[PDB]
């Protein structure tokens, strides 16, 4: 009953 | 496998926790390398934390980043109650009635049947309360469960038993209660 | 409380391998396949009353494949401890013979996630209709898996899992035959 949203992954620091 | 090379794993988890339909909701970001959690992003804090050592570092780097706060802090709203409206008619609000059979079996291979399964499946959701009686009155010892099973396809199975020597003109009766029925299921069986 | 949503992916080297999943309450919505980039729908009917972008979940693998890049060498390469499975082998329900019927095979609590898992009838490896699911989560980190086999029920028919994972010295099996 609509569209799913991932959420986003976040790089480490190097 | 032939094959001994070293593994390495690293996973990431988002957990929405949903209380009195949307009215309170938590979420959790997690990642975890090599079964350890390093570091927790928890909305009843607003903050990333280290979990370990291993991962202070991340947590004073994301820390520092108030784009990233702000989105997560937000996330509450933007994605946990977004996906549960998404979700909500068909996880929620689904709803599948058990099968129930009753039927006998024995403790010990060749002896006497001294054991009534009462087989409940194809069920959904996961909350079930199942009930013996011998002639109309419950039942409470003697009572063995596989507990509650989860199929993978969206469906739940438990088998309950009650260890008893069935004595010839007794009524034996499974009985079940569900969401999905507004009252008890109930099957009979005859000794 | 109430209920649960999760979100799950996973990376996994030197094997390469990602996974990306949606879990209600145990039970999963949907996962994306790596190789085709395109999300599947645990049950047919999901498809009908939501979507998902795909590209959102491949952006997250590669983000995840870099992330374990920087975690392993900054642990010194301390690899995962292989935790070997348990596995129950149960019925679809009670079972009456010529009652076409689903033998389901349960892995559970091991890590990392590759396994290989075989159906046998009377010894001989088993292909025609089996299906299985993708890695699912765990509060604890490990993983669980399903693989599933229709039959139709006999006598003179037995059955065994056929589970095999680097944390096992030995191939584990679980029996099942018709009782009655």
């Known amino acids: ?14 | 496998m032939g094959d001994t090379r070293p593994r390495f794993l690293w996973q990431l988890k988002f957990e929405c926790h949903f209380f009195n339909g949307t009215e309170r909701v938590r979420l959790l970001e997690r990642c975890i390398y090599n079964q350890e959690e390093s570091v927790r992003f928890d909305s009843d804090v607003g903050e990333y934390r280290a979990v370990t050592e291993l991962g202070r570092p991340d947590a004073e780097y994301w820390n520092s980043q108030k784009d990233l706060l702000e989105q997560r802090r937000a996330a509450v709203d933007t994605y946990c109650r977004h996906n549960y409206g998404v979700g909500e008619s068909f996880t929620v609000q689904r709803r599948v009635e058990p099968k129930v059979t009753v039927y006998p079996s024995k403790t010990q291979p060749l002896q006497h049947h001294n054991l009534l399964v009462c087989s409940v499946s194809g069920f959904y959701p996961g909350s079930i309360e199942v009930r013996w009686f011998r002639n109309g009155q419950e039942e409470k010892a003697g009572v063995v469960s596989t507990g509650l099973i989860q199929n993978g396809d969206w469906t739940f199975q438990t088998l309950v038993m009650l260890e008893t020597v069935p004595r010839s003109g007794e009524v034996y009766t499974c009985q079940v209660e569900h969401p999905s029925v507004t009252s008890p299921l109930t099957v009979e069986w005859r000794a | ?180």
Request: net charge negative; charged share 25%.
């Open chain 3, 1 to 180: 409380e109430e209920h649960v949503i999760i979100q799950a992916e996973f990376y996994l080297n030197p094997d390469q391998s990602g996974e990306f999943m949606f879990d209600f309450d145990g039970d999963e919505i949907f996962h994306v396949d790596m190789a085709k980039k395109e999300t599947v729908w645990r049950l047919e009917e999901f498809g009908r009353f939501a979507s998902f972008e795909a590209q959102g979940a491949l952006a997250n693998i590669a983000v995840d494949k870099a992330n374990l890049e920087i975690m392993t060498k900054r642990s010194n390469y301390t690899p995962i401890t292989n935790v070997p499975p348990e596995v129950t082998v149960l019925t679809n329900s009670p079972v009456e013979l010529r009652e076409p019927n689903v033998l389901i095979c349960f892995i559970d609590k091991f890590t990392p996630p590759v396994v290989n898992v075989t159906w046998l009838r009377n010894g001989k490896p088993v292909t025609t209709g089996v299906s299985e699911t993708v890695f699912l989560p765990r509060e604890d980190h490990l993983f669980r898996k399903f693989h599933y086999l229709p039959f139709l029920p006999s006598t003179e028919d037995v059955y065994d899992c056929r589970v095999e994972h680097w944390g096992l010295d030995e191939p584990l099996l679980k029996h099942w035959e018709f009782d009655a």
């Open chain 1, 1 to 14: 009953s609509g569209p799913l949203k991932a959420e986003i992954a976040q790089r480490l620091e190097d």
